[PDB]
Amino acid sequence: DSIEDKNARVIELIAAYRNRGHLMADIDPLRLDNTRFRLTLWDLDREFKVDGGVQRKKLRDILSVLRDAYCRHVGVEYTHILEPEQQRWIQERVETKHDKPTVAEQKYILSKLNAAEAFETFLQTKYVGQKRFSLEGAETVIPMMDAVIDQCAEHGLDEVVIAMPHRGRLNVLANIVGKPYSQIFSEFEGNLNPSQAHGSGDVKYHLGATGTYIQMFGDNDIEVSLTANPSHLEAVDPVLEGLVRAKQDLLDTGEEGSDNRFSVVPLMLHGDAAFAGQGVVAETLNLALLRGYRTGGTIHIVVNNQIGFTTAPTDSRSSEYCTDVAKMIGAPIFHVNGDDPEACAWVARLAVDFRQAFKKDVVIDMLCYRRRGHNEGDDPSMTQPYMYDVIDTKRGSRKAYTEALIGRGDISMKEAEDALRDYQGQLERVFNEVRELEKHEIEPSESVEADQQIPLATAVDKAMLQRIGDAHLALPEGFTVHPRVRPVLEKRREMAYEGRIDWAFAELLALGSLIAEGKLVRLSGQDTQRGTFTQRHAVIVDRKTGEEFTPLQLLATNPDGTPTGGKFLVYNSALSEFAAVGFEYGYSVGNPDAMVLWEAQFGDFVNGAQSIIDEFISSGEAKWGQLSDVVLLLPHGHEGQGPDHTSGRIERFLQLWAEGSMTIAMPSTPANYFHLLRRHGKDGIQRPLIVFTPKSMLRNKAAVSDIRDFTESKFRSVLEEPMYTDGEGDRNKVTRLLLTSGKIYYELAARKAKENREDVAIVRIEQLAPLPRRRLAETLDRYPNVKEKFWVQEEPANQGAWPSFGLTLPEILPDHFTGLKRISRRAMSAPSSGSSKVHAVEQQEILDTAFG
Amino acid sequence: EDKNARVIELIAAYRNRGHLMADIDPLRLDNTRFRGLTLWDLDREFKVRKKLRDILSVLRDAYCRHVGVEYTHILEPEQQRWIQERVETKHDKPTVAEQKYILSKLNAAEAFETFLQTKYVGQKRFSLEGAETVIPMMDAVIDQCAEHGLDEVVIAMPHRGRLNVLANIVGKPYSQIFSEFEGNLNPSQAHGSGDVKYHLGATGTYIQMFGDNDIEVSLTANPSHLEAVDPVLEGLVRAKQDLLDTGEEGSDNRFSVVPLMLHGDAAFAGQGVVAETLNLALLRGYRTGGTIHIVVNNQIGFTTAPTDSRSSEYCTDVAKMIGAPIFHVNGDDPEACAWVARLAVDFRQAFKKDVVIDMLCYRRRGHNEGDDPSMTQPYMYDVIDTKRGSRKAYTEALIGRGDISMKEAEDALRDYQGQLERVFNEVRELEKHEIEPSESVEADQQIKLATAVDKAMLQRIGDAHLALPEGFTVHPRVRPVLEKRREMAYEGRIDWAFAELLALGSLIAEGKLVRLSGQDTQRGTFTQRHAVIVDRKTGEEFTPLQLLATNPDGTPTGGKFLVYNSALSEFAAVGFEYGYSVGNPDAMVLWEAQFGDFVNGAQSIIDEFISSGEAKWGQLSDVVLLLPHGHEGQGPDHTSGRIERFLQLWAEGSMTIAMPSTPANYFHLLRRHGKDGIQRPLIVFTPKSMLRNKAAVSDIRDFTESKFRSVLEEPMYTDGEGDRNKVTRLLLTSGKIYYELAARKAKENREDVAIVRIEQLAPLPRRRLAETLDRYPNVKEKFWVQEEPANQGAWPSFGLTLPEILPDHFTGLKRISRRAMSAPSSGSSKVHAVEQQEILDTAFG
Ligand SMILES: Cc1ncc(C[n+]2c([C@H](O)CCCC(=O)O)sc(CCOP(=O)(O)OP(=O)(O)O)c2C)c(N)n1
Ligand SMILES: Cc1ncc(C[n+]2c([C@H](O)CCCC(=O)O)sc(CCOP(=O)(O)OP(=O)(O)O)c2C)c(N)n1
Ligand SMILES: [Ca+2]
Ligand SMILES: [Ca+2]
Ligand SMILES: [Mg+2]
Ligand SMILES: [Mg+2]
């Protein structure tokens, strides 16, 4: 009504654009949604109060600033950000006049759209019947990624690490990372050399590459990497993060680094349907600001072609944008029109600037379209006739941008034509040279087992064990240890000097000795600092102040004061399995010289990371030549705590095992666990280790080891009873042999002692995979009067080691294992019964059968 | 002049950021939480005409007291306005009777926990102490649902106060919870292998204390795997809504079945399935009309601080992805908690959208009742030890307000304590049963079932593909599918894709509800299904099988065809379909993977629900998993449905596992599954290239006069001029490799070799297999042949079980397969072809 009323209506209008302007922005190059674009006129020329300091601006000028910033080809979502300094930063860079690119920069963008579109048309011409998951309709991704990388080089960063799905993957490999065209062309020809034909392999749009990006207008260079992935969309997201964090830790940058540059940048590409539908996206975003996982912000690019094969976005998500999940971490989101390559390159540079300023994730939603079917052989008008009727009228971004550069007089029609002829002439020359190569004979894929051959002294000095023991009592000045934590630290110093070392200390003796030798040790998982079973105490919390103390971190310094090079990185993970296991797998790939251990609360929850186990951990070497030394610690054992607190599903890991891809163990003694970890960290082999770890056996007084087992011994794949190797036991009295693995040994041994059964022997198989054939055959030959052999296990008949051992043992060793029978629980649907009482009755039946 | 503009920006600051200043944490852990207009402006009237003092007092009460409101992220302005109007007004104080009722809820909640502490000090119970307000809050949710006249509230929750909720909300007898702690279960409770006490469910009828309405209250079973039950709950509710003719597939838009989903703060932010389930909230094939979420935010995850649990301010920030309003409420204010719970139900009823309540509280004891939390959280537990619980604090406010006396409050606790002791003593007095090992559930559900249909039924389903609406324009490449199907229905040579629709269509015609979903399932990954056809000119949809829901005389059959394109999820989508089948046991529920290689994204559902739910909880599901499978040279992720993993999981006849080789056999497998009366999941390994194999077709008689065949012989012996006595080598197989072996046998005229197919992989068809092999008396060698690597396919289980169940028939059985491999296959189609030819050469060499 009045001046005070009018000025208040302007402030509401200013906030509506900043909050909701993106809903009116011309971001969709297809204009599919018809209803998208659903105070007096005398007040437009009046001057209003604006806090920008405070200045007086005409309503028309305020309005035009808001429309240009928020309602053109860029939809900006940032008012959900809780940090006011971040809202101010974006608001200042978005609500100002943007400097137009130079003619040279515009021409360079055009060259990126030329290379992008002519690569996809050349492939449509030469290999019309092969899938390539074309980037056609989304060519703007290439100048956009180029701008991200160029802006990272402009900030003087060290590396950009990419992860992406199928969409434009080959295009990115060739035009961004620098994968030779000849290599891509040789893949389509299906003529691979012995190096490319190694292992079982994988499809062309799953492969990675490395290279050096050189600035076109600047004087800096930056490393560009692209990591391998399975078909399983978004599964590589935590793997990328782990890989980057491992690289950042090595360059002394980021969270565990001297500077706060986070000089290794994750550039993560996504499809619009997969970004909203896959849970691992939220799991990986949730890691973005965590101390144990932060990479200083990820640059996310969503190639939003408004389709998921035949599925419309309406059936893909319950939200306006495919990127709305990124709001959970307060990430700014830029929705940009794919037909405006200049707006796309500008948003990409703004994204990198935001990441560098706040060490936080940024999401770019590139609205585009998919010119062809889902694959190049699919007909999309069957399911999307309206969308494909609009695409057929649509001139590509390259043709449109070419017509803009000719209009602006920047280039001629001849220069534009000649540049396309040059590019297609170059591809034809390389395609012909590749086709001219002599064709190799196709042979069946071969096992990778022999690609990595085992050398190994894992025994340490008594002074080493004592130093790790002393570290547990080398408390900072005035530190107050919790009264129930103090006996663990004192009992460990006692263990290190007097023996009877339990499982929990043997683990820290292994990790501590590696740190002392200069190894980087990364240990993480749910409540891993203290330990689920209050056993580890890798970090101790001051009772009065809350201050933390990490005893093994003292092993990173030599007694002469110099560093060993080693480090202890121990964290409490978020409540995730998929992202946490993926991250640790990626971390080991990123730093092959690191000791990387991930611990499940109980092995029963590792099935939440099944895609990582199946697609990365068990098969990555055979498929991509990608090596990982990740350790999975899986608390396992029948103790009456129910079907979810019992099994790490040993049978599933043994089923997945082939070609010596992983080591699978279930050690029964602390010393054997110690040597297993040291062998894994020192063998020079990069292969995952699956360890089935104890729960109650952690506090079993029989399950302790002598100092000489650490100082003058090595890993034992097969273990005999101490009464035969160190005692006065007679092996020739044995008629029944019991073959087992894990904690059930101690129960069988206690029953043997109670009944003085000299006729029965118990042999433990510590290394489940690869089977210790030679050592097992030698061991059995030491018992010549054996008339019957039984595989004994607490696990149901369809679980544990029996499904694989019952088939493999009589086949690999027919002389020793023909007639081998099973003693176990019945086959069960669940890993165990829900009642502790019923567990006890079943457990006693097993030992009665084994001795009856 | 500028003042009125600062007032509007200030109003906006409270609505936008006021929740960051709200006194929501009952522990006040964060010390720094509470950090253009004059004091003269407070009495002046401003444009929103209201005085500044009244404007600020309304903004403080609504946004900065015990309730933190997040709603300005909501894109629908009418939803922001709805919240605004209900939050920025004077709230009517509860009556003395209502306050007393809230106190009775906190009394029951806290005394149940202190009683279990006293009697069973050494047993885990994941106590609700420090979070007791959850009970009056859930009561308010359920009471508000009854006030809206809804039919049922279905709950899913984790361990935190599960026992308490069961006893004080659902109405599970105290005697039953006490018998569980005693460890003395009757034959009915000791059935199957079972599960732990805080995994079990219950059902009951809630009766309003002050109203005249009643509502059903259910609590569903779940594993330890936190949040895994979230999509299962949604599926269960959607199946119930579809039965009540409410919701998306109902005549009314009431969605009268309400999901009430409880969460722990660390699991809500860390588990991806949360985002996957939220993503389903407004989808046509999955919407339940909004879920009421209650996060029991005790600001701890066992020993893990929230700083290591999430990268955001609140544990509930993932719910912003679907524009859900979030209410952060102080757990020490049970009245604010009950009021927010009723507001939540009112928002769900108005907008058919999810609402999230973040109940800020604390965990009085350790993670479990035996854990010492001061080892890792000494500051937090030093603050908890000074804190008086919510029950004692609310009691003191009620004696202060003059509402109750100290005697009435004391006497009410003595009454509750006396009642619990009386029930505990009666339970302890019961005769103790002998503990025996758990038994297989195989015999709990016992199966000659006629699955054949009349030819007039095949013809009707064929005609339905051509019974197009007036003026409908079929895509030129879709029209031959429709016409070839009407030809197939009358002339035979029925392919796989049509045999599927013949099965689903005949069930619909018989009155069955059919739900089919998965990624690109309406058209089909291999462009073969066309369950829905899209008008080339208008985009309008036509579903041919939906015509089978009406009889020729115009009356309905009772059947329905619900076919959807799922979101790009496996975990949530498989969980949802499992829960749908549990919710409606009379429905035919099929979920289809794009390729079986992606079902490992739903591994927790397969492991924790599908394969073991019957043995653990007595929870039955008839869910069908369709898994496209087969070695064709498309790489390690487009080849295997990991058959070896499903066979490994199989035990106690929990599931049926099949790999049919013919359309007719697939048809009868689906019809047997839908008509057998048994509620057990069906795992089907389905074809890709075999869909278009001209040898893989069936006759009309195979549908009208035959039945499911667990084992199949070559047609040359059953219908041709082949001599079984000439056979010396027998090849045992399953799936598409049969046709390749059969083509090699014909090419070489190998009468000495026979190929026998095992269609039903689990349970193994012992009798038929032995009866079939007995027809080949001159067999000198038997081989299990498979295209899958040695450590994959059926060999790992069959190589061990076949010589054991049939020693006379299978002793000396050898394997013909690919070598053991880390990946399900090679990446090169050329290398695949070389390996495939080696198998064929070995089998015939
Ligand atoms: C977990 C999981 N569940 C299912 C699939 C099957 N699936 C995909 C392919 O099979 C892999 C493609 C090629 C390969 O790598 O082998 S793509 C697709 C459409 C995705 O669309 P979007 O909108 O995200 O991307 P676009 O529009 O396509 O750019 C679906 C459903 C999968 N790969 N992973
Ligand atoms: C996927 C998955 N990964 C790990 C676990 C192990 N885990 C849990 C238990 O084992 C389940 C409890 C016992 C049982 O049901 O058997 S609770 C927990 C802490 C919960 O934090 P929160 O803040 O969310 O809950 P509260 O504060 O406690 O109310 C973790 C880590 C799991 N069950 N599921
Ligand atoms: Ca190694
Ligand atoms: Ca059934
Ligand atoms: Mg897409
Ligand atoms: Mg918690």
Q: Kindly write down the DSSP assignment for every residue of A78-120, as one continuous string.
A: -TT-S-HHHHHHHHHHHSSPPPPPPHHHHHHHHHHHHHHHHHH
Contact B593, B518 (CB under 8 A): yes
The secondary structure of residue B13, as a DSSP letter, is H
The secondary structure of residue B568, as a DSSP letter, is S
Q: Is residue B772 lining ligand 1, measured as CB closer than 6 Å?
A: no
Spatial separation of the C-alpha atoms in residues B404 and B751, rounded to whole Å: 95
Nearest to B353 by CA among B565, B71, B635, B686: B71
Spatial separation of the C-alpha atoms in residues B6 and B38, rounded to whole Å: 11
Spatial separation of the C-alpha atoms in residues A715 and A679, rounded to whole Å: 8
Q: How far is A248 from chain B (nearest CA, A)?
A: 19
Nearest to A312 by CA among A276, A365, A282: A276
Contact A672, A714 (CB under 8 A): no
Residue A416: helix, strand or coil by DSSP? Answer: helix
Residues in chain B with CB shorter than 8 Å from the CB of A621 are 822
Closest CB to A830: pick one of B534, B568, B615: B615
Q: How far is A191 from chain B (nearest CA, A)?
A: 10
User: Do B47 and A200 count as a contact with CB atoms less than 8 A apart?
Assistant: no
Contact A263, A251 (CB under 8 A): yes
Residue A155: helix, strand or coil by DSSP? Answer: coil
Spatial separation of the C-alpha atoms in residues A266 and A258, rounded to whole Å: 20
Nearest to B272 by CA among A275, A591, A770: A275
Distance (angstroms) between ligand 3 centre and the Cα of A811 equals: 29
> Residue-wise over A158-186: b if at least 16 C-beta within 10 A, else e?
bbbbbbbbbbbbbbbbbbbbebebebbbb
CATH 3.40.50.970 domain position(s) in chain A:
73-435
Spatial separation of the C-alpha atoms in residues B95 and B461, rounded to whole Å: 63
Spatial separation of the C-alpha atoms in residues A501 and A535, rounded to whole Å: 13
Spatial separation of the C-alpha atoms in residues A729 and B374, rounded to whole Å: 48
Spatial separation of the C-alpha atoms in residues A197 and A192, rounded to whole Å: 6
User: Do B284 and A543 count as a contact with CB atoms less than 8 A apart?
Assistant: no
User: Do A574 and B308 count as a contact with CB atoms less than 8 A apart?
Assistant: yes
Contact B187, B124 (CB under 8 A): no
| Paired tokens of B369 | 């009742």
Q: For ligand 1, pick from A233, A237, A372 the residue to mutate: most ligand atoms within 8 Å of CB.
A: A233
As its CATH architecture, domain A73-435 has 3-Layer(aba) Sandwich (3.40)
**Gaps in chain A with C–N over 2.5 Å, residue before each:** 38, 52, 455
> How many CB atoms neighbour CB B402 within 10 A?
8
User: Do A15 and B20 count as a contact with CB atoms less than 8 A apart?
Assistant: no
Contact B30, B80 (CB under 8 A): no
User: Do A526 and B304 count as a contact with CB atoms less than 8 A apart?
Assistant: yes
Cβ neighbourhood burial of A788 (10 Å; 0-12, 13-18, 19+): exposed
**Which residues partner with A598 through β-bridges?**
A524, A632
User: Do A830 and B274 count as a contact with CB atoms less than 8 A apart?
Assistant: no
Nearest to B515 by CA among B454, B608, B581, B606: B581
Closest CB to B651: pick one of A315, A645, A828: A828
The secondary structure of residue A295, as a DSSP letter, is -
| Paired tokens of A489 | 């630290």
Nearest to A76 by CA among A159, A17, A161: A17
Nearest to A616 by CA among A579, A565, A646, A671: A579
Interface contact A231, partner B, CB < 8 A: yes
Spatial separation of the C-alpha atoms in residues A161 and A277, rounded to whole Å: 24
CATH 3.40.50.11610 domain position(s) in chain B:
630-655+710-845
User: Do A838 and B183 count as a contact with CB atoms less than 8 A apart?
Assistant: no
Spatial separation of the C-alpha atoms in residues B740 and B838, rounded to whole Å: 12
Spatial separation of the C-alpha atoms in residues B447 and B120, rounded to whole Å: 43
Contact A602, A532 (CB under 8 A): yes
- Which ligand places an atom closest to the C-alpha of B673? 4
Nearest to B777 by CA among B797, B748, B754, B802: B754
Which of B234, B438, B604, B795 to mutate to test binding with chain A, by most A CBs within 10 Å of its CB?
A: B438
Spatial separation of the C-alpha atoms in residues B121 and B115, rounded to whole Å: 9
Residue B465: helix, strand or coil by DSSP? Answer: coil
CATH 3.40.50.970 domain position(s) in chain B:
66-428
- Which ligand places an atom closest to the C-alpha of A645? 2
Q: What is the residue whose two structure tokens read 């007694």? A: A559
User: Do B304 and A12 count as a contact with CB atoms less than 8 A apart?
Assistant: no
CATH 1.10.287.1150 domain position(s) in chain B:
1-65
Please state the φ and ψ torsions of residue A837, each to the nearest 5 degrees.
-65, -45
Residue nearest to atom 34 of ligand 1 (CA): A232
> How many CB atoms neighbour CB B746 within 10 A?
10
In chain A, residues 38-57 whose CB comes closer than 8 Å to chain B: 49
What's the one-letter identity of residue B397?
A: A
In CATH, what number does B630-655+710-845 get?
3.40.50.11610
CATH 3.40.50.12470 domain position(s) in chain B:
429-629+656-709
Nearest to B635 by CA among A656, A168, A207, A570: A207
Q: Binding site, residues of B?
A: 160, 199, 224, 226, 265-267, 298, 300, 638, 656, 672, 707, 710, 760, 767-768
The secondary structure of residue B719, as a DSSP letter, is T
Cis amide prior to A230 (ω within 30 degrees): no
Residue of A nearest to B538 (CA): A386
Residue of B nearest to A538 (CA): B376
Q: Which fold has domain A1-72?
A: Helix Hairpins (1.10.287)
Query: Which strands, in side-by-side order, build the sheet including A689-693?
Result: A567-572, A520-525, A595-599, A631-635, A689-693, A663-665, A767-769
> How many CB atoms neighbour CB B755 within 10 A?
25
The secondary structure of residue A378, as a DSSP letter, is -
Please state the φ and ψ torsions of residue A450, each to the nearest 5 degrees.
-75, -10
| Paired tokens of B151 | 């039919």
Contact B350, B108 (CB under 8 A): no
Residue of A nearest to B310 (CA): A286
Closest CB to B799: pick one of A192, A529, A807: A807
Cis amide prior to A772 (ω within 30 degrees): no
User: Do B378 and A541 count as a contact with CB atoms less than 8 A apart?
Assistant: yes
| Paired tokens of B643 | 């058959």
Contact B474, B533 (CB under 8 A): yes
**Which residues partner with B686 through β-bridges?**
B628
Q: Binding site for Mg(2+), residues of B?
A: 265, 298, 300
Nearest to A798 by CA among B191, B617, B800, B446: B800
Spatial separation of the C-alpha atoms in residues B641 and A649, rounded to whole Å: 19
Experimental technique for the deposited model = X-ray
In chain A, residues 281-320 whose CB comes closer than 8 Å to chain B: 281-283, 285-292, 294, 308-312, 314-320
CATH 1.10.287.1150 domain position(s) in chain A:
1-72
- Which ligand places an atom closest to the C-alpha of A368? 5
Q: How far is B653 from chain A (nearest CA, A)?
A: 9
Angle CA A24–A28–A34, to nearest 5? 65
What's the one-letter identity of residue A693?
A: T
Parallel, antiparallel, or unpaired: how do β-strands A264-271 and A159-163 relate?
parallel
Contact B789, B824 (CB under 8 A): yes
Parallel, antiparallel, or unpaired: how do β-strands A540-541 and A548-549 relate?
antiparallel
Q: How many helices and strands in chain B, by DSSP H and E?
A: 30, 24
Nearest to A719 by CA among A653, A666, A757: A666
Spatial separation of the C-alpha atoms in residues B271 and B278, rounded to whole Å: 12
Distances (CA, A) of B820 to A230, B792, B797, B831, B837: 20, 7, 14, 15, 17
Superfamily of domain B66-428: Thiamin diphosphate (ThDP)-binding fold, Pyr/PP domains (3.40.50.970)
In chain A, residues 713-772 whose CB comes closer than 8 Å to chain B: none
Q: What is the residue whose two structure tokens read 């294992």? A: A817
B656: left (phi over 0), alpha (psi -120 to 50) or beta: beta
Spatial separation of the C-alpha atoms in residues B575 and A705, rounded to whole Å: 46
Please state the φ and ψ torsions of residue B112, each to the nearest 5 degrees.
-65, -40
What element of type H or E holds B116? helix B96-119
Spatial separation of the C-alpha atoms in residues A489 and A335, rounded to whole Å: 55
The secondary structure of residue A545, as a DSSP letter, is T
Contact B764, B737 (CB under 8 A): no
Cβ neighbourhood burial of B759 (10 Å; 0-12, 13-18, 19+): buried
Distance (angstroms) between ligand 3 centre and the Cα of A167 equals: 35
- Compute the 3-state secondary structure of chain A and give helix, strand, coil in percent, each to the nearest 5: 45, 15, 40
What element of type H or E holds A597? strand A595-599
> Residue-wise over B173-197: b if at least 16 C-beta within 10 A, else e?
ebebbbbbbebbbeeeebebbbbbb
In chain B, residues 86-145 whose CB comes closer than 8 Å to chain A: none
Contact A570, A524 (CB under 8 A): yes
In CATH, what number does A637-662+717-852 get?
3.40.50.11610
> How many CB atoms neighbour CB A333 within 10 A?
22
Q: How far is A472 from chain B (nearest CA, A)?
A: 16
Distances (CA, A) of A88 to A11, A84, B804: 16, 6, 73
> How many CB atoms neighbour CB B51 within 10 A?
14
Residues in chain B with CB shorter than 8 Å from the CB of A294 are 311
Spatial separation of the C-alpha atoms in residues B430 and B179, rounded to whole Å: 9
Q: Which residues, 6 or more positions from A374, have their beta carbon under 8 angstroms from its beta carbon?
A: A307, A309, A310, A380
Q: Binding site for 2-oxoglutarate, residues of B?
A: 199, 224, 638
Strands (E), B201-349: 202-207, 214-219, 257-264, 292-297, 326-330
Spatial separation of the C-alpha atoms in residues B107 and B471, rounded to whole Å: 68
CATH 3.40.50.11610 domain position(s) in chain A:
637-662+717-852
> How many CB atoms neighbour CB B829 within 10 A?
15
Q: Which fold has domain B1-65?
A: Helix Hairpins (1.10.287)
Which of B11, B620, B828 to mutate to test binding with chain A, by most A CBs within 10 Å of its CB?
A: B828
What element of type H or E holds A60? helix A59-70
> How many CB atoms neighbour CB A2 within 10 A?
10
Closest CB to B435: pick one of A316, A619, A838: A838
The secondary structure of residue A164, as a DSSP letter, is -
Spatial separation of the C-alpha atoms in residues A98 and A78, rounded to whole Å: 19
Residue A763: helix, strand or coil by DSSP? Answer: strand
Nearest to A622 by CA among B791, B557, B754, B287: B791
Spatial separation of the C-alpha atoms in residues A704 and A698, rounded to whole Å: 9
Contact B166, B128 (CB under 8 A): no
Return the sign of the alpha-carbon dihedral for residues A529, A534, A537, A538.
negative
Interface contact A661, partner B, CB < 8 A: yes
Relative to the CA of B263, which ligand 2 atom is closest? Answer: 24
As its CATH architecture, domain B429-629+656-709 has 3-Layer(aba) Sandwich (3.40)
Note the maximum CA span of chain B.
Answer: 110
Note the maximum CA span of chain A.
Answer: 110
Distances (CA, A) of A485 to A448, A539, A807: 46, 11, 47
Distance (angstroms) between ligand 3 centre and the Cα of A627 equals: 10
Q: Which residues, 6 or more positions from B622, have their beta carbon under 8 angstroms from its beta carbon?
A: B581, B585, B587, B588, B589, B673, B674, B678, B679, B680, B681, B682
CATH 3.40.50.12470 domain position(s) in chain A:
436-636+663-716
First to last CA, chain B: 98
User: Do B311 and A329 count as a contact with CB atoms less than 8 A apart?
Assistant: yes
Contact A799, A650 (CB under 8 A): yes
Closest CB to B1: pick one of A3, A602, A658: A3
Nearest to A565 by CA among A596, A539, A594, A524: A594
Q: Which residues, 6 or more positions from B549, have their beta carbon under 8 angstroms from its beta carbon?
A: B508, B556, B557, B559, B560, B561
User: Do B310 and A286 count as a contact with CB atoms less than 8 A apart?
Assistant: yes
Spatial separation of the C-alpha atoms in residues B281 and B261, rounded to whole Å: 13
Nearest to A374 by CA among A363, A361, A387: A387
Contact B360, B26 (CB under 8 A): yes
User: Do B272 and A579 count as a contact with CB atoms less than 8 A apart?
Assistant: yes
Relative to the CA of A233, which ligand 1 atom is closest? Answer: 34
Residue of A nearest to B653 (CA): A829
CATH 3.40.190.10 fits A436-636+663-716, yes or no: no
What element of type H or E holds B416? helix B406-428
Q: For ligand 2, pick from B302, B304, B310, B376 the residue to mutate: most ligand atoms within 8 Å of CB.
A: B302
Q: How far is A217 from chain B (nearest CA, A)?
A: 37
| Paired tokens of A296 | 């200083």
Q: Is residue A272 lining ligand 1, measured as CB closer than 6 Å?
A: yes
Helices B795-805 and A802-812 cross at an angle (nearest 10°) of: 80
In chain B, residues 387-416 whose CB comes closer than 8 Å to chain A: none
| Paired tokens of A324 | 């709305």
> Residue-wise over A736-754: b if at least 16 C-beta within 10 A, else e?
bbbbbbbbbbbbbbebbee
